[model samples]
Target: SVIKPEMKIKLRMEGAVNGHKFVIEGEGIGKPYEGTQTLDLTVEEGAPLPFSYDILTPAFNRAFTKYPEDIPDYFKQAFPEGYSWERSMTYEDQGICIATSDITMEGDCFFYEIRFDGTNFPPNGPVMQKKTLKWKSPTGKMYVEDGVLKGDVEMALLLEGGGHYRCDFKTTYKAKKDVRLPDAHEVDHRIEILSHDKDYNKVRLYEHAEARY
Candidate 1:
């Protein structure tokens, strides 16, 4: 009936400040004790970003400044009406591997944001990971069978604290047989973080355009 014992941290990203209750979805017991499997990332006390769904969502929102002005109506069909999404993660050495389900755009249509370091960054910062997958139609049908944004984009994921000294973006998205869309694309802007005590916080923009390798 109630998962009391397993109810602790109700989280929406920043557990360092506010959160509670997590349930690992699983089979249940209709009798003696009832419980579910969990998907907790565990312990983000002093860790980098701690990388949670709620945490990364805004990041993605900010990462991309906008959609291509020339986006057609056809591609809109493949996308969710609203820009909503859901995410899951697994901890790793470099960072947490994340999968985002584009709710409005296309069901089963998803993308991977891997090895994202969230250390040194506060949960409430300007740091964002703008993730977008551009889908181009072939000829007739409005459905895009398959699509892929395969590449490794390297850049800094800024946090209030020490961000990724070397954060990597090894992306590989495949909405297999996914319906097509209009024009599309993506990127990650880099920067040089400067600490204080000696001077004001300085951030140097590495590249503004499609310049970095």
Candidate 2:
């Protein structure tokens, strides 16, 4: 049995994180193969959500802190201390060779990160099955809209025999003084909404068809 753990915002304003989705994921090991767990992100309605502190914030902080101090009014309103804001910070379909991860007064430093290969595409994508990324005080491009701080970082999808080519993503948020991480929702529950992706209507056709040998 496959585990089906996906996500959506509560007031879901295109990624208004209530700080409660990390307790989220694909399904778990078959126990009866448990289902997804929801994170409690109590939204404020309408506009995008704000950022919160705790567990997930480390990545958020690193991504947004790139241009924190020079932000506009909203920056002061939400974080006041840069890590400026954006709708969604993402480094996607790009080359991200992570060199090292460290801690400093500035925050966590992910060194030697090559945003993209100097000259663009190699004939076969990237031949590196495994490599070490470089880091600096910080690296890569970043931006924000509201409180959604999106940018590059050590976060992404890892595949076998593949260089670190992943989608670095983040959602928008507002500023709040009492921000805290959302509580983890119980994982054992009934199935929730599922999208068959495009051409989903085919489910009906497949339903009546016999299994292939």
Candidate 3:
């Protein structure tokens, strides 16, 4: 037979001069699971920057409380209780290896690609998952309509000047699912730029630039 225990979870977002990092902490309210607990996370960057999520167990809730600020508001709202914030030192010469262009609507959805260098960042390192995102826009509203992962590739970062860096990435995007709408309403698609760092408490939004078509 299996027993369940109460759990408390919390997230904290911190920023530094170099970049931002997230820490998720949780506590167990009852019996602790003897087996090793693991967390599976999914990160998405719509238009501005990407968002990250982590699954925690009961035993880890008590000792966890810190996390990064890049977590999506919708995700955070899912768990209203057991969360807190903390401040830390900052690092310098910080830059985002991955950068995305403004999402452009090709047909019924928006499409765009992200390029990054994996040498320093590594494939699925720092930020996990990369692809061209598509959204459905109805009435030309700026919202997430639908999304697709075009492709995945490794990235390498090349240092420039003034704390600026160039990223080289081999990426691909594919249609995950389809978006179908009613005859009267049409889907609106757009891409937004978003970012996160270990030294900051807020998710950074990037400006719209030209995209590769």
Candidate 4:
């Protein structure tokens, strides 16, 4: 027999970055191939961030600064801020979209940092190889689900590249639910040559919070 790809996921995220708001909700399905596997993700309910083109340049630069191997030219400067941004992407590399999070108590509120990362062996430039996500909460009370910490509160995500966001939302983790957690756990924290730089950073954050391991 063969070790078939076994994974299912459904992810939904709604929030704002520096008051520029949007929502990305999607479902993913896995598959087995000749010598590899894949995770197909489709953003169902989505909208693009309204940040100006001048905003994301620094985020892209920072991302490139952190990961020098990722070719900046491979990604285009075309920003897809229409009905959907990057409607679909496939994870066919050795690693899937694995994610993890950390909740720390800072002052009277809680600080949340969610991150996701992956790589493609030979990059064709059509697939996203890496990403990360983070946000903050108003409280310290939280719980763990499917090995990932979950929470619901008013939050914000700020980046080193100068993109800031605030919103009210809830994070979920169910071992058997759509967007389920895998065995491992893994942000901007950067974006380059992809989407608008600010929102690419935003997608980085969204991917981190939704990925599981």
Candidate 5:
């Protein structure tokens, strides 16, 4: 079953950095996985900041810092001792890309536009590509269709070892508005992971959101 709004979900990923040391931790929302959720990180005492979700740079670092136990063993073997890394740079790279515009509701149905840049990773390593994604949400139900987008990764990465890689993913969602109570409803979402390198592709999902009572 899909998760509901206002509900919380926790996920952990563990593995090695350089093939020796291990890294583990919980993942927040909007950063990875499917739906749009945000993660609040407390790097320093009494200071919680929202981590960026547009790129994986911050996510990788934050995950390693928290739950180091969830890392996978394969990563530990590859990077016996954990290594340090930083977000060197992020450019508007191309690949099988899928993006959605604002979602709006109308007559028990929602509508949205998706732009897909038909570019995705090849089966071996990262491939620079692009595409457009399209979707529609009606009666709280979501639907999506892809364009000429085509490509594949050589292999999916292990849990924690794959280096900087880029890929595309698609997500569909449905949301219902409350009738009697003013502003209240339910939402469902799904995300598909497209990898750049098949051998080193990994997909993680998490959920974090503001609670309403």
Candidate 6:
């Protein structure tokens, strides 16, 4: 029984994060040999969520450091003061390229990365993709809102072959005294896919999407 059957699945997500309502709508099509998916998501404006330092302790323990200040100078030099810090996390599934987020502070910084070619598109949408796209807000800015430290910036999306898009992304977090990196933080993302060109006409081999790590 080697007959190939085609199938498609509707994907939709609804939930509240950090007091903000968000949603994801998409569809997936699959066959015995290949499959494809698409998504359009939105997150409403919301306050920062409480993130605990305990989540990072394991990585810290593995490196034998109890505090951010204790990290080696090699990495600390990037930050001006004693405790300026950063962290990066990537989300993926099986062998597909999803998304990568980097949060840095000592001032403010954040990057949302993605992979795209002809066949790969981030689950969030083409608008959320970074990397090749030149950021409109190349650098992030930190400010206090309701006693919470948050980061905000806008970005541009440029396809390897051709095409241009732009969007806004926001985040929030907190740090402790003498900590080079945030002991507790939240990814609290506010993504806005602004109006832009929607022409995916080009050619570029977006190979082995996960190789960029």
Report RMSD for candidate 1. 16.3
Q: What is the lDDT of candidate 3?
A: 0.22
Task: Estimate, for each residue in 82-192, the C-alpha lDDT of model 5 and write its tens digit.
Answer: 122211222224323332223322322222221222223232333312121211121121122332111121212122233434333323322222111112222233222
Error of 5 at 172 (Å): 20
Using TM-score, give the best candidate's number: 1
Is candidate 3 or 4 superior in lDDT?
A: 4
Off by over 4 Å in 4: 1-4, 31-46, 51-213
Which candidate would rank higher by TM-score, 1 or 5?
1
Task: List residue ranges in candidate 3 displaced over 4 A.
Answer: 1-164, 178-198, 209-213
Model 3 Cα lDDT, one tens digit per residue, 140-197: 2112333322222122222222222222222122222232221111111222224434
- Superposed Cα deviation of residue 4, candidate 1 (Å): 40
Model 2 regions lying over 4 Å from their true place: 1-69, 73-76, 79-158, 168-170, 176-213
lDDT of 2 by residue, 1-213 (tens): 011122121111112132212121111111111112222332223222112111121221221111222223222233322222232333353432211111111122111111111111232342222221211112333345323433333343333454544444333333334333222111111222223222111111000001011
Q: Write the per-residue lDDT of candidate 4 for residues 70-117, one digit (tens) a residue.
A: 322110111111011111112233322223333222222222233332
Error of 2 at 210 (Å): 56
Query: Local error of candidate 4 at 91, Å?
Result: 25
Q: Write the per-residue lDDT of candidate 6 for residues 26-136, one digit (tens) a residue.
A: 332223122111222221122121211111111110011111233221212322222222222222211111121221222222111221111122434432333244322
Better of 2 and 5 by lDDT: 5
Between prediction 1 and prediction 6, which has the larger TM-score?
Answer: 1
RMSD of each: 16.3, 19.3, 18.5, 18.5, 19.5, 18.5
Task: State how far residue 177 of model 6 sits from its true place (Å).
Answer: 2.9
lDDT minimum window of 10 residues, candidate 6: 204-213
Kindly give the number of clashing pairs for every candidate. Answer: 30, 31, 62, 14, 62, 1
